[PDB]
Structures are given as structure tokens and as C-alpha cells.
């Protein structure tokens, strides 16, 4: 359940180590953002000499959350590390390669690129 | 919070009459040949003699 002022790892090759969610989108006032939800964050720590650096506000899709997420068939999914992937302007993974797994919930729409880039699920 | 005015005699007695008691129901019991009144709650104990009768 990612919300405002929540730190979370980045799964990409953009240098950003961990970002900090600012506010959730897709609603007037959304408290939490589960798997497949886009949010705005700011790079708090990145690899020296990377594309993005500390202080650059960007957008990222919430994937690989920690809290349990229920499916339509009664199953549940939960990871051990709150992560996300920095998305491009409209809809695209900012980067070239993903490292950690991704939740199948991303398959809703417009995330086929991320689903194919993620080497799992 | 303190009483501003003096409660009237009627306003006092109307509620003071509520501070009453309810008499308990009695039951006739034959013990040692004599009949005596004991509530139904202690009726069972009256037969065995676990209820002192002054």
C-alpha cells in the first residue's frame, strides 16, 4: 500500500536506487496505490553518473508491492520489497532492462512492454 | 458544573419517589411440619435445610 512520503526501490537501469512517492494519480484523493498504479516520485538516491539524478521528479508505475493483493480467483500475491519502475511521459518504461519480478496485474493495459521486459510472470 | 438554582419540592419528590424497593415473591414450604414463606430462589435450599429460619 504505497502512499505519500513512501520510499521504494527502482527496478530499471536508469541509476535511480530508491524513489519517494509524492501523490497518487487516477483520482481526486487516493490513499493507497497498489500494483499497476502510476504515481509521481522524486529520486532520493541514484548511481553516480546515471541518467537520472537526485532531485529530478519523475513518474513510476507501482509494481512488486509488499502488502497482499487479491486476484479475481481468490488467490493472493505479495512480495518482500516495495519496488516500482520509472515510466516515460505517457506510458513507457524509462530504461532498457528490468531486474526484479513484476505482478501480472500490470497486464491491464498499455504495460505490455514492461511485462515483456520483466524476466518473470 | 454546579447547581444554579434550588430544586423545587415537587421536582425533588417526583424523583425521590423512584428510589424505592421491590418486594420479593414468596412461596409456601413445609419444613418440620410448619408452613413458612421462602422465596422461590431459596425454595430448593429450604427443602434440604441450607436456609436458616429464625
Amino acid at each position: 500500500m504505497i502512499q505519500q512520503e513512501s520510499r521504494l526501490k527502482v527496478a530499471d537501469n536508469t541509476g535511480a536506487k530508491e524513489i519517494l512517492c509524492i501523490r497518487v494519480l487516477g483520482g481526486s484523493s487516493r490513499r493507497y496505490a497498489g500494483i499497476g498504479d502510476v504515481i509521481v516520485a522524486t529520486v532520493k538516491d541514484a548511481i553516480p553518473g546515471g541518467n537520472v539524478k537526485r532531485g529530478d521528479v519523475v513518474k513510476a508505475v507501482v509494481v512488486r508491492t509488499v502488502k497482499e493483493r487479491r486476484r479475481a480467483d481468490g488467490s493472493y500475491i505479495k512480495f518482500d520489497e516495495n519496488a516500482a519502475v520509472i515510466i516515460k511521459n505517457d506510458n513507457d518504461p524509462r530504461g532498457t532492462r528490468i531486474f526484479g519480478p513484476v505482478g501480472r496485474e500490470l497486464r491491464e493495459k498499455k504495460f505490455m512492454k514492461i511485462v515483456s521486459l520483466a524476466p518473470e510472470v | 458544573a454546579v447547581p444554579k438554582r434550588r430544586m423545587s419540592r415537587a421536582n425533588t419528590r417526583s424523583r425521590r419517589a423512584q428510589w424505592k424497593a421491590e418486594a420479593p415473591g414468596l412461596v409456601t414450604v413445609s419444613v418440620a411440619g410448619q408452613q413458612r414463606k421462602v422465596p422461590r430462589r431459596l425454595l430448593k435450599a429450604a427443602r434440604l435445610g441450607l436456609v436458616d429460619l429464625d
Binding site: - | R41, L42, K44, A45, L48, L50, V51, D52
Partner: protein
């Protein structure tokens, strides 16, 4: 042994267990106890469970009885004298009666006894 579902009988926790243990001991020792209504009510199932353990007592049950009762003589008599005396009764060995209240605190008083038949 059902939870009291509310404020315990004897002050705070860790005391109701000892109270029930002492009450069951006194009951199994004397054959009749006179206590408060709620105390006897809470003791009824405790005493019945102890009596069932005694009935089933062949081994490993003396330990279950001793982990709750401390009087060795009381445990011995409960295991020997009572023993199979209730081997035919399929439960309900403790009879509860209500008596007149005592002075001072108007606490409903009850009396527990062991059915003899």
C-alpha cells in the same frame, strides 16, 4: 473452562485460576462448598473437567490434574475414592444451589455439591 467473557472474578488476571484451583481442591476434599454465585458457576465446569480427567485417569492424567491442583492428598483421594464412582454418569457431577445472601455486601451465595445418587 470457557473464558469468563468480561472482568475476572478475583481482581486482575492470574488470580482467577488460583481461586478456581483452591475452590476445586476444597470441593474434592470436603464434599460440599459454600461460595459466591459466580464463583460456583465458574467452578462447576472446572470441577467437571477435573472429574472427567480423574475418570479417564490411567496415566498422563495424574500429570494434567497435578498441573492444576497442588494438594497431593487431595489428588490422591480424588483419584481413589471418587475414581469410577462416576463411571456411569455421562457428565453433570456437580449440583449447584442458591442460598440466602450474607450481610454487608449483598452477594448472591451459592453452594456446590458432588452428586451421590
Amino acid at each position: 473452562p470457557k473464558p469468563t467473557k468480561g472482568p475476572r472474578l478475583g481482581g486482575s488476571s492470574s488470580h482467577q485460576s488460583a481461586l478456581l484451583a483452591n475452590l476445586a481442591t476444597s470441593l474434592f476434599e470436603h464434599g460440599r462448598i459454600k461460595t459466591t454465585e459466580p464463583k460456583a458457576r465458574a467452578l462447576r465446569p472446572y470441577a467437571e473437567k477435573l472429574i472427567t480427567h480423574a475418570k479417564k485417569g490411567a496415566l498422563h492424567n495424574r500429570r494434567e490434574v497435578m498441573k492444576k491442583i497442588r494438594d497431593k492428598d487431595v489428588v490422591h483421594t480424588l483419584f481413589a475414592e471418587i475414581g469410577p464412582f462416576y463411571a456411569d454418569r455421562n457428565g453433570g457431577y456437580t449440583r449447584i444451589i442458591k442460598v440466602e445472601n450474607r450481610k454487608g455486601d449483598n452477594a448472591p451465595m451459592a453452594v456446590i455439591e458432588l452428586v451421590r445418587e
